[PDB]
Amino acid sequence: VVGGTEAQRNSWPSQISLQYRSGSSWAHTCGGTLIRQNWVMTAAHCVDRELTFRVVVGEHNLNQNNGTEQYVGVQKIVVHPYWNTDDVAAGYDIALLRLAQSVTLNSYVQLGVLPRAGTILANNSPCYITGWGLTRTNGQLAQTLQQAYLPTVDYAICSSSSYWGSTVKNSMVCAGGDGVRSGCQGDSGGPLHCLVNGQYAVHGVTSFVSRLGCNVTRKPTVFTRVSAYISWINNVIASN
Ligand SMILES: *C(=O)c1cc(N)ccc1[C@@H](OC(C)=O)C(=O)OC
Numbered sequence: 586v587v588g589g590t591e592a593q594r595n596s597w598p599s600q601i602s603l604q605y606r607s608g609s610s611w612a613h614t615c616g617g618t619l620i621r622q623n624w625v626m627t628a629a630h631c632v633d634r635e636l637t638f639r640v641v642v643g644e645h646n647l648n649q650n651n652g653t654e655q656y657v658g659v660q661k662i663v664v665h666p667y668w669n670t671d672d673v674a675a676g677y678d679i680a681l682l683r684l685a686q687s688v689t690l691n692s693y694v695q696l697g698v699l700p701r702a703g704t705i706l707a708n709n710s711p712c713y714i715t716g717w718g719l720t721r722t723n724g725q726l727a728q729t730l731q732q733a734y735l736p737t738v739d740y741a742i743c744s745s746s747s748y749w750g751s752t753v754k755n756s757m758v759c760a761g762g763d764g765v766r767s768g769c770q771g772d773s774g775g776p777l778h779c780l781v782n783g784q785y786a787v788h789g790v791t792s793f794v795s796r797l798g799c800n801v802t803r804k805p806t807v808f809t810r811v812s813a814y815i816s817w818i819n820n821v822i823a824s825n
Contacts, residue, residue, distance in 0.1 A: 588766035589731035599697035602641035616775025618697035627774035643693035658685030702815035708739035712779040718771030735761035762805035769799035
């Protein structure tokens with residue numbers, strides 16, 4: 586997260602760290618959202634590599650023991666059938682991770698609330714991006730969970746030429762694009778939490794920023810629109 590502020594410990598308790606085994610250590614790669622005590626939602630992109638992955642719930646500082654962590658193995662990964670590694674701008678940047686165990690829910694560990702199917706937000710809707718990603722373009726990961734206020738930008742503006750054009754599809758949410766605040770690599774997979782009827786709900790799974798840089802005026806961060814996937818997400822869980 587470019588241009589963000591440290592989050593309070595308990596603000597975003599559905600945030601996870603997606604980590605891979607890196608020699609004899611574990612490194613953060615992605616975010617995600619805990620959606621069931623045994624299921625995480627992230628981006629397909631985050632699991633293109635055939636690596637050994639773990640989930641961290643209740644994470645605040647990547648490098649220090651918070652006294653609130655739970656560390657859980659990934660038992661099965663289910664990527665969207667239409668995801669293609671070579672075409673992110675096609676969309677379907679969505680994955681569901683089944684965990685090797687159910688996590689215990691407490692103040693640091695809650696489920697993410699998903700929108701109703703089909704739900705589209707109005708332009709300039711109040712949303713936050715969270716995550717441990719890079720804090721400048723070509724910079725380094727954050728140690729503590731960062732948040733940025735990132736209002737939405739509706740599809741008609743986002744798909745205009747001076748924005749993303751045709752790169753962006755109505756299966757995606759765009760948010761931000763001020764030049765100052767963004768998602769950045771390491772936030773892929775994470776949540777875009779948006780305030781609807783006085784409750785924060787996860788409308789976005791972080792997908793991409795510009796090759797030109799993370800914080801680029803009129804290049805909003807692009808999310809997979811969760812409301813487009815609710816039938817698929819339910820259909821996976823009921824059967825897996
Ligand atoms: C996501 O964590 C990530 C990581 C790496 N190494 C490259 C790209 C990405 C995505 O970044 C974000 C901000 O989502 C990405 O831009 O995918 C196209």
